[PDB]
Symmetry: C3
Subunit: 262 residues, 3 copies
């Protein structure tokens, strides 16, 4: 059901079953599939393709030539009714592609809120993007990739399959990420190696002097101490006792399966 | 002539002379030029541009914002009626570009069958792509490039002009291929260097233990022996006497003009 | 006002206020905003989006899925009426994006004449592209970037923000340009380092033997002499006294703010 306050341009095609919310904009030459849901104030500028079982939140700006909810590029996929979820206030730029998940991997590609997906950023099947993340021009996420909150992926950077980008991380431009990246760190190169802590980002987002200094100690324990991960895991866990921001490390370790970048 | 069982969406524009086959799908906002030929069961999802002298086979899936048969990016080209040929069951993804050839280079850009051209894969003028090849996201083929059967080109990989990618080759992601790549080998880096034989790929495609071991001996002769190519050419030629799979090397050598990656 | 000799395809949408010149082509499914100006003989093939305060010259060929004059990707931008200017005879290929400037940076994105912007070349806010420049497939210009005349930027090359690419420069493929690049030089790698003078380019464009030899002496003064820039600045300035082509260096030095590539 289409709300009586939403604008559907006479040239745009919206299939029956597609529920469009109040004050939404469906621009010219847009295609909205029968299983698609579009929320309040969400704008599809023009030439936008949204299909499949796709749920889209409120106040989103989806630009021209973007393809959302489309069939993924996994050879195993055979046409199963999988899902796509996008949050609120996301700025999805031109030629951006967000694909549906696969049955083998969970059946869901998930995108959070307040993110900026710059021109030709790709989000593959079964990916999970958090909140306020930035993917620059040509940033490619391979299958099953987690991008946690406030993480920034620079231009022409392919994050390899199954890899997890931690919270508040900044992967530099032209990088190749082959393994898991712990929260708060800078990653550059191909393959990507660590280059200290994102000291600027944490200062801008309002982290206290104690927290930033404690995070750097956790970084020193992980990369600079000379011990293995099993030895520094419980030492970080008790450093997190005083500083709740260091808990992001221990939570991340439980999810990490590809190992850390070194 | 359009077959009476093909679907042409009322918003799509098909020029007169364009021959569309039985049970083909021409989605909304698609443009099909007067010299275009589209075969049985071929689907153009939507927003697809097919122009020029372009021959397209059967059961193809061409996705949104793809541009096929278009004028190429060679400065020498002046508008000559050149050709494009695409085989069967090819999955041509979003924003993919396949261009027409040039008079100077043969006048034909050729694509085989059962290939997967992932998002924004570029096929330039006078290129020749074989069967069951895979070009990942942003994989760019420069002019006059041959990609032989079963070859895989990873994400954001530019194969330089005139270069030949052998059969069953796997060029890794973010690579730069400046020279010819012999069949069966793994290529990584920029510029791309060899990293052994694609042992996994050959096992999956059904090569015998003898053949894989013989191919590795041919690799050892080429890269690990310490002799030049002229010395190992006839030694490979008589190794191919027992093992027909090694003939792929000697056939490749006759076509190679840029030299091998080392 | 639309000229009575221009072709506006019945499916294309042109807003009121948009001034289209004589013998211009507005192809099917094109969108032209109310503040857009299109000159004589300019062709928009199809599926082209031109919006914002955008001035476009004569004899341009803008291909399918190109987005010109669009809102930029700067987080500071809030919707200010900024400007885009494109010159004459430019070949703007598929999926190319040229954005509007920002108030903070000057309010203007400027593109010269006779340029070739190959598939998916990005021109960000406040950029300045000169004449007869070439940006290959996936070449990304970040914000506030100057590209001087006859400069060539290869495939998948991100020129970082504020950087200046000198006249007659050739940045190779897959490169990362983090600093200013002096006129006449070859740049390769990531980050990009200098590799001599573009000797071929200068010979093709008609530079005299004396001028090319003098430019190479200026290169030798800058990179090979063993002195700092402040010591070689006035020595170049008096070398330019005899050879007017060396003046391009001293003019460039006044504009350079990020330092030279070394
Ligand atoms: C192209 C493709 O479908 N990729 C998916 C696949 O990747 P995955 O890493 O599993 O790659 P696949 O095994 O699917 O390989 C696909 C093709 O590459 C060949 N091959 C495979 C392995 C090898 O070492 N060498 C080689 O040449 C195979 O013969 C086949 O033709 O599953 C992942 C996990 O579900 C997904 O994230 C990917 O989206
Ligand atoms: C951009 C272009 O048209 N590329 C085509 C050209 O490449 P090719 O390698 O021949 O490049 P071109 O010689 O056409 O060069 C095009 C531009 O680059 C300049 N230049 C050239 C050489 C040099 O060493 N330095 C330099 O600066 C020229 O002045 C010209 O303005 O022919 C190849 C073979 O037919 C094709 O595969 C390419 O698609
Ligand atoms: C993404 C964006 O808007 N980029 C613009 C910004 O870049 P600039 O280099 O200024 O990057 P910003 O400071 O805008 O950073 C944007 C995001 O990155 C985070 N951050 C910033 C700095 C840092 O060292 N680490 C970090 O993580 C910030 O918290 C913010 O969330 O202004 C430039 C100059 O006007 C423009 O050329 C760019 O187009």
């Amino acid at each position: 059901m289409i709300d009586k306050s939403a604008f559907v341009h006479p040239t745009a095609i919206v299939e029956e079953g597609a529920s469009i919310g109040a004050n939404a904009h469906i621009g010219p030459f847009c295609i909205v599939g029968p299983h698609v849901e579009i929320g309040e104030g969400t704008v599809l500028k023009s030439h936008v393709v949204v299909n499949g079982h796709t749920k889209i939140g409120r106040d989103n700006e989806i630009y021209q030539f973007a393809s959302i909810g489309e069939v993924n590029q996994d050879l195993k996929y055979a046409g199963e009714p999988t899902r796509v979820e996008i949050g609120d206030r996301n700025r999805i730029r031109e030629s951006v592609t967000i694909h549906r998940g696969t049955v083998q991997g969970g059946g869901l590609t998930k995108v959070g809120s307040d993110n900026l997906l710059m021109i030709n950023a790709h989000i593959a099947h079964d990916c999970t993007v958090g909140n306020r993340c930035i993917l620059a021009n040509n940033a490619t996420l391979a299958g099953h990739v987690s991008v946690d909150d406030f993480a920034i992926i620079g231009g022409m950077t392919a994050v390899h399959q199954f890899c997890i980008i931690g919270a508040h991380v900044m992967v530099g431009g032209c990088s190749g990420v082959a393994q898991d990246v712990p929260p708060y760190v800078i990653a550059q190169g191909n393959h990507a190696t660590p280059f200290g802590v994102n000291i600027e980002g944490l200062k801008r987002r309002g982290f206290s002097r104690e927290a930033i200094t404690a995070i750097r100690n956790a970084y020193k324990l992980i990369y600079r101490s000379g011990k293995t991960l099993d030895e520094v895991k419980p030492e970080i866990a008790e450093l997190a006792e005083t500083y709740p921001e260091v808990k992001a490390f221990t939570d991340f370790f439980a999810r990490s399966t590809r190992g850390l970048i070194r």
